[PDB]
Amino acid sequence: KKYSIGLDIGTNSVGWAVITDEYKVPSKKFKVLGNTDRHSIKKNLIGALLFDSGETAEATRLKRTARRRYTRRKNRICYLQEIFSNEMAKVDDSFFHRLEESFLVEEDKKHERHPIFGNIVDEVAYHEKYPTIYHLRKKLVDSTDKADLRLIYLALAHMIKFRGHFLIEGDLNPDDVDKLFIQLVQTYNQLFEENPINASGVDAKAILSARLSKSRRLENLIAQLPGEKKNGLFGNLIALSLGLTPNFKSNFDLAEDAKLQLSKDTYDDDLDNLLAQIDLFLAAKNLSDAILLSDILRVNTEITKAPLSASMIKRYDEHHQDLTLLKALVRQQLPEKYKEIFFDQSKNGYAGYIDGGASQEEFYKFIKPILEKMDGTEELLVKLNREDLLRKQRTFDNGSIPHQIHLGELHAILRRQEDFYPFLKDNREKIEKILTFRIPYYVGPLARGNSRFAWMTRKSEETITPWNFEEVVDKGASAQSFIERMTNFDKNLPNEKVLPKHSLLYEYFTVYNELTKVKYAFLSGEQKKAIVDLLFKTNRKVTVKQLKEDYFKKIEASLGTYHDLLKIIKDKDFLDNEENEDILEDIVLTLTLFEDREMIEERLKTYAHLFDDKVMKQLKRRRYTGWGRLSRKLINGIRKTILDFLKSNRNFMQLIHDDSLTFKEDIQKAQDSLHEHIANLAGSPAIKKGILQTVKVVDELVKVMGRHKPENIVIEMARRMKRIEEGIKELGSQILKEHPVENTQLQNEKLYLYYLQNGRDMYVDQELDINRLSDYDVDHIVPQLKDDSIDNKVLTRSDKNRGKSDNVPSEEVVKKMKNYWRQLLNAKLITQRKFDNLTKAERGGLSELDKAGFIKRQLVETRQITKHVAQILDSRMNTKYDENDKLIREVKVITLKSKLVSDFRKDFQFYKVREINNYHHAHDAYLNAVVGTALIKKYPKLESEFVYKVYDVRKMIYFFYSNIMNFFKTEITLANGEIRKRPLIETNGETGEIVWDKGRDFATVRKVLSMPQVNIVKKTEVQTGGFSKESILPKRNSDKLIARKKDWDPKKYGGFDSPTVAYSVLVVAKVEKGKSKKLKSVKELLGITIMERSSFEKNPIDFLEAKGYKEVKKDLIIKLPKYSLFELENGRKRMLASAGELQKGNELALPSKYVNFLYLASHYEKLKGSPEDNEQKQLFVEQHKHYLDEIIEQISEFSKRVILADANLDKVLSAYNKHRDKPIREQAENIIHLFTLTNLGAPAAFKYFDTTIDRKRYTSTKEVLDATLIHQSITGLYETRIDLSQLG
RNA sequence: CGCAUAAAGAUGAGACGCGUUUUAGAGCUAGAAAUAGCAAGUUAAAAUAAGGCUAGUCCGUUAUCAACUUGAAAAAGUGGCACCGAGUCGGUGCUU
DNA sequence: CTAATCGCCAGCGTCTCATCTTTATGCG
DNA sequence: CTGGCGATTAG
């Protein structure tokens, strides 16, 4: 009673099928449990399983980072508040209390309404003196009077709360653009004795103030004083202001690469190196400062010290001026449009721009034609083109402001009010340290131990303020654990980390693996030490023949990092010592790990007695990358040593596995769960969900067949005009004059074949006459390997093009195509795939190795995820062992590729339509199963090609002519228009076993493919995610609003809406009826939100009690997650979607003649075969065109049975009776769009030919309380039916 | 089997700029009102999943999940077979 | 005086750094 | 995209 299992794996579906040896899916009757009266269900062993897609973890990461940033911002404000705390009580005691409770309503306040001053007249006087905060900041910077302390706190708090970016390192003082651009040429003339033409008027930074990222900046540098090299024209301007890329190789006349950069960390060390091995750099830095503050600062810096506040005040004043000017102009010209612009908040006028939800762009687009209609509005259009008309202060493009501007304003504020308050003098650097502090990206979250994501190690144990940060956290250990927690361990010893790529032990290992088993006569013995000492360790790159022959004549994979450490340390003494070897092995790890140059300075100040300061700086400026693959205890931790064996001609892997001394310890050290095994796979989680469900359904199917292992498990993992322009540019002839070069409407190959082959045949130099669609057809360059590529066909006029059965091109074609067509393939008119396929007949024809390449290109799959899931299934299924300790292969895992089964669909007319029902997953699984077991029955030894002896296919060519699956066809064709018959009953190579009895197996495949009942299961889930929609709605008198905090009532403050239901519960109880408090009983379905899910799983009874229910039955609480299945009268099925909405559950089983007729009518102009076959298909579809009325009757009876959507049904029928008089090919698309009315899942809105049908949603769960609840297993074969009418 | 280049994806850390919601920015004139006419408008405070206890300048949207019987959890265990047919599975026979 | 139905609605842009895998593409 | 919600209609 052997059997086999076929599996199709997708990202939203898993299809499974169980077949016997006769390719017949069996059936069986199963017991059902519960309290109903049915006791046995007959079911077929084929089906699918559908689920929601998996989600990546990026959105949770972004929200986690947002939470951390909000907590840290609140802590910054709290730090400033407690540093102002103990002295504010002299002026105002409850000032911070009024500043805290400013959100809530006057009836809930405990102080005055006006927060900043506590009364009315001072509030109005303050807001009249200062309209914004920027007037206050400019007054506090410029004026030298003793201000109030509350104003100083307000300015500092606004400066600390928003504090710019950190993308520019180094200090930055506000210096013009062209006023310093000539000073660069002044230093260039006083430092470089040449002729630098000071083009006063070239306007480098001024034209670079526009969109001049690279191209326009380089163009402005080119349209200037010409430079002899690119390093002077573009490169020097890059190293001064723009995106820098200099080099001290052919530009700075150096003997070593001393490459500077922009404002970064390594620029100061590179400038110290360039000055200590060989002003103008200050002028370049000032030019960089001018180019950086070009676009953001739009005001002179002479009259004031704070440029940002002056820019904002200027923007405020121009907004006021243009506002009153536009008011006067619209009062003059169009007085009837006043209210639509200045009063209507719903429109996109000025009132919508200020009080509504209008942005800048919608306001500009709304006000542009009204401003164009009037007159006298020229400069307003000038401003509107420049995006400087009625501009706000807190805009969406203030993100370019660096933090040094805010730091300078804060420093001037603290300097000006210094001598009036002494605690400002005592705590200046504390406040500046509050503003500029930023946690480094390798220290991570400052935790204590209760974190899934932290790696920080502490020295002491106290709170971490920004002032004692460097005193508490160890930075070197944190920077080491930041890297070492990510790099993988080696596969041999699974607990040890991996050496760096440029380690000395790894370099010795790779040079010994190169020159231990080296033969060119095999190499010597003890002379290999002298060989690696002289030739390898002296030459920077070991030669292939030259230096080896020189070393052989003198005596009788490079170590580049050894030479770098030799010339950096300027000797060769410690580079070969004993303890200095492991010391240098620590130094190379130090150089690989960190990238901060100061913790590096500490870790090499650990080793100060090996060099002076100069060698120390020369090696400290170095860097490396890359991590290797091996270990240290693998090579020099097992004792001889592996390096001792590799030094003195066996391979390293041959020393590891083949030798019994080494392979025992690694196999012992190889000594998780399933979820941990899938968790460290590769690829998207959307595939990993399907992989886990595949393992579960395989284990369940093994369980249901009486604990017998299967035989085979088959796995399938499912998944231009510029060329014509390039051909017209390379041709030069009339490629666009008469025949237009426009591949826009051209979708078929009838135009692309003329465009690729330049309007002539690949073999004949004749007129193609492309105006005829009944013209020259297409001919494949190599027929049955199946291929339909662009470079896999040819368009000759009318011939057989040669005389052959295994070769398409002829000798005259190869003689005539050698100059023109081969140059066209060399000029990329035709691709390289067509050139080799057209010229390969001139090299002996179809050789045996080419047939091997063809069958290995048609059979072998390449993806890694399929190999890994095959490995998982083979390790979980085959587990026994013999006395020699070998794997006892009781099952065979066979992987396929979808091209084979797609060819099997399109060959024998087993057509697939995705829009009808979800049966095609199970049908693809069944077809995969039968194709796999037939192919493993026919060609036995070729199991070594895919089932996971070599048996290389060079002396096997079983297969004779072209293809692997060419034995399925009962009448094989030929190349040059011929036929070749085939026997009926196939058999194996040596064994006697009929495999492919044609009539019986095809009748069985039709009978299985037309089976009405398969098992479709939608996987029930408990919903998780956000609590509700993230928008905040204004206040209403509704009851659906959720409070944003604990004591903020939503009828006064607003809140969120539309919460997400986790699951539902069925509650039977009694509630108050009428004003007499009558206890009328009720059976109700209630929805549980996620916050309520936690609070309800803590305690159910008190939760349902306080909700409003009394005297519940505690044992009758039934949990119902999403997609719970309910069966109703007449086989109507409904899936629960929420507490108050259902979804369609049933499925439509159309007969096979209808789906074949639909596939023929849909692609009526895209047959893509032989002309006789296309003519026969056209006669087959046009010979009877009344199936579609029967299909309409089919879906009418179905929708009257289970859908109950009669209004949309009558709309569909009226649309069909309207569009009766139509062609067939335009009617197949409408009748195939029609099938989403009766589909499975959520009700969608489709579209007919002209009209559009809306969706009938199912917003009522009153019927479900008198239904049959189904509890399904993972395959749907084990059920539990519960009659809810008998419950309670 | 190993190197070089490029692209894509996954995972984690650190930072910006907006947006949204309530309050504060005394609206004026005429009528008893309904209302009308007029003037103004750019900013700030606070919250940004309710909250949790291990009280940290932590943690809270990823992954996992039919029912029943055991188990604190982890995890383990629970369902007869052939044949003729097919509108969501039905019927016949043997043995329990 | 409650239930069906219709129509609208739904947080978003950027930057810095690190480690892996996989695919294509040459070269031995 | 698919469920929630207010304004509106229908029994």
Specify whether the backbone of A433 is left (phi greater than 0), alpha (psi in -120 to 50) or beta: alpha
Retrieve residue A233's tokens: 């024209």
How far, in Å, are A53, A676, A716, A873 from residue A685 at the CA level? 9, 14, 18, 18
Retrieve residue A102's tokens: 């400013």
A1036, closest nucleotide (Cα–C1'): D6
Task: Tally Cβ neighbours within 10 Å of residue A372.
Answer: 11
A847 touches strand B (CB under 7 A): no
Task: Select from A600, A603, A602 the least CA-distant residue to A623.
Answer: A600
Q: Which residue, chain included where needed, has tokens 């004792």?
A: A639
Q: Which residue, chain included where needed, has tokens 């730090």?
A: A79
Q: A1116 CA, B65 C1': separation in Å? A: 21
Instruction: Say if residue A253 carries a ligand binding annotation.
Output: no
Sequence-distant (6+) residues with CB within 8 A of A166 are A402, A403, A438
Q: Please, which residues bridge with residue A981 across strands? A: A971
How far, in Å, are A750, A812, A847 from residue A835 at the CA level? 20, 15, 18
What resolution (Å)?
A: 3.3
* N-to-C CA span, chain A: 47
Q: How many residues comprise chain A?
A: 1288
Spatial distance between the Cα atoms of A813 and A626, rounded to a whole number of angstroms: 52
Residues of A labelled as active-site residues: 8, 780
**Cα torsion through A248, A254, A256, A259, rounded to 10:** -20
Distance of CA A1192 to the CA centre of its chain: 43
Spatial distance between the Cα atoms of A1139 and A1062, rounded to a whole number of angstroms: 10
Retrieve residue A781's tokens: 């360059």
Where does residue A654 rank: exposed (0-12), middle (13-18), buried (19+ CB within 10 A)?
exposed
Spatial distance between the Cα atoms of A414 and A424, rounded to a whole number of angstroms: 7
For A1081, the 3-state DSSP assignment is strand
DSSP conformation letters of A1049-1071: -HHHH-EE--BPEEEEEEEEEEE
Task: Select from A83, A93, A94, A100 the least CA-distant residue to A152.
Answer: A83
Q: A1049 CA, B71 C1': separation in Å? A: 46
* Long-range CB contacts for residues A604-613, cutoff 8 Å, separation at least 24: A607/A583, A610/A569, A610/A574, A610/A583, A611/A569
Task: Tally Cβ neighbours within 10 Å of residue A768.
Answer: 20
For A868-903, give one letter per residue: b (16+ CB within 10 A) or e.
bbbebbbeebbeeeeeeeeeeeebbbbbbbeebbeb
**Residues A136 and A154 sit within 8 Å (Cβ to Cβ):** yes
For A1210-1222, give one letter per residue: b (16+ CB within 10 A) or e.
ebbeebbeeeeee
For A543-555, give one letter per residue: b (16+ CB within 10 A) or e.
eeeebbeebbeee
Spatial distance between the Cα atoms of A493 and A665, rounded to a whole number of angstroms: 9
Q: A1058 CA, D6 C1': separation in Å? A: 13
Check the CA dihedral A1158-A1163-A1164-A1170 and report its sign: negative
Q: A1260 CA, C3 C1': separation in Å? A: 10
A1028, closest nucleotide (Cα–C1'): B49
Q: A1087 CA, B39 C1': separation in Å? A: 53
A1256 touches strand C (CB under 7 A): yes
**Residues A230 and A245 sit within 8 Å (Cβ to Cβ):** no
For A700, the 3-state DSSP assignment is helix
For A1125, the 3-state DSSP assignment is strand
Sequence-distant (6+) residues with CB within 8 A of A960 are none
Instruction: Say if residue A52 carries a ligand binding annotation.
Output: no
Q: Please, which residues bridge with residue A1028 across strands? A: A1059
A960 touches strand B (CB under 7 A): no
Distance of CA A744 to the CA centre of its chain: 31
Question: Residue A580: which H helix or E strand, with range?
Answer: helix A579-593
Q: A1047 CA, B50 C1': separation in Å? A: 11
For A546, the 3-state DSSP assignment is helix
Footprint of strand D on the protein (CB under 7 A): A 1036, 1038, 1040, 1057-1059, 1061, 1087, 1137-1141, 1143, 1241-1242, 1244-1245
- Three-state SS for A3-20 is CEEEEEECCCEEEEEEEC
Q: Please, which residues bridge with residue A887 across strands? A: A881
Specify whether the backbone of A387 is left (phi greater than 0), alpha (psi in -120 to 50) or beta: left
Spatial distance between the Cα atoms of A373 and A395, rounded to a whole number of angstroms: 29
Specify whether the backbone of A61 is left (phi greater than 0), alpha (psi in -120 to 50) or beta: alpha
Retrieve residue A706's tokens: 């009486």
Task: Select from A1058, A1054, A1029, A1030 the least CA-distant residue to A1044.
Answer: A1054
Longest dimension (CA), chain A: 118
Task: Tally Cβ neighbours within 10 Å of residue A1187.
Answer: 17
Beta strands in A232-385 (DSSP E): none
**Cα torsion through A460, A465, A471, A474, rounded to 10:** 70
Strand bridging mode A1015-1018 / A1125-1127: unpaired
A865, closest nucleotide (Cα–C1'): C22
Specify whether the backbone of A118 is left (phi greater than 0), alpha (psi in -120 to 50) or beta: left
Task: Tally Cβ neighbours within 10 Å of residue A366.
Answer: 18
- Three-state SS for A119-132 is CCHHHHHHHHHCCC
A1044 touches strand B (CB under 7 A): yes
Retrieve residue A306's tokens: 């704070």
The number of helix segments (H) and strand segments (E) in chain A equals 56, 23
Spatial distance between the Cα atoms of A952 and A942, rounded to a whole number of angstroms: 9
Task: Tally Cβ neighbours within 10 Å of residue A831.
Answer: 15
Task: Select from A651, A502, A629 the least CA-distant residue to A642.
Answer: A651
Task: Select from A1232, A1228, A1233 the least CA-distant residue to A1161.
Answer: A1228
Protein chain A, residues 1121-1140, with a C-beta closer than 7 Å to any atom of nucleic acid strand B: 1121, 1131
Spatial distance between the Cα atoms of A1041 and A1050, rounded to a whole number of angstroms: 6
Spatial distance between the Cα atoms of A1239 and A1185, rounded to a whole number of angstroms: 25
For A210, the 3-state DSSP assignment is coil
Strand bridging mode A13-19 / A46-50: antiparallel
A464 touches strand B (CB under 7 A): yes
Beta strands in A344-476 (DSSP E): none
Residue nearest B62 (alpha carbon to C1'): A57
Spatial distance between the Cα atoms of A365 and A353, rounded to a whole number of angstroms: 12
Helix A475-484, helix A579-593: angle, nearest 10: 80
∠A517-A523-A529 over CA atoms, to 5°? 90
**Cα torsion through A414, A415, A421, A425, rounded to 10:** 90
Retrieve residue A633's tokens: 């205890």
Distance of CA A68 to the CA centre of its chain: 24
**Residues A1069 and A1042 sit within 8 Å (Cβ to Cβ):** no
Helix A378-385, helix A360-373: angle, nearest 10: 150
Helix A920-938, helix A898-907: angle, nearest 10: 100
**Residues A477 and A616 sit within 8 Å (Cβ to Cβ):** no
**Residues A1121 and A1172 sit within 8 Å (Cβ to Cβ):** no
A1118, closest nucleotide (Cα–C1'): B67
**Residues A1156 and A909 sit within 8 Å (Cβ to Cβ):** yes
**Residues A943 and A958 sit within 8 Å (Cβ to Cβ):** no
A486 touches strand C (CB under 7 A): yes
Helix A685-704, helix A864-877: angle, nearest 10: 30
A28 touches strand B (CB under 7 A): yes
Spatial distance between the Cα atoms of A301 and A173, rounded to a whole number of angstroms: 11
DSSP letter, residue A47: E
Instruction: Say if residue A716 carries a ligand binding annotation.
Output: yes
∠A468-A474-A476 over CA atoms, to 5°? 135
Sequence-distant (6+) residues with CB within 8 A of A93 are none
Retrieve residue A36's tokens: 């109903």
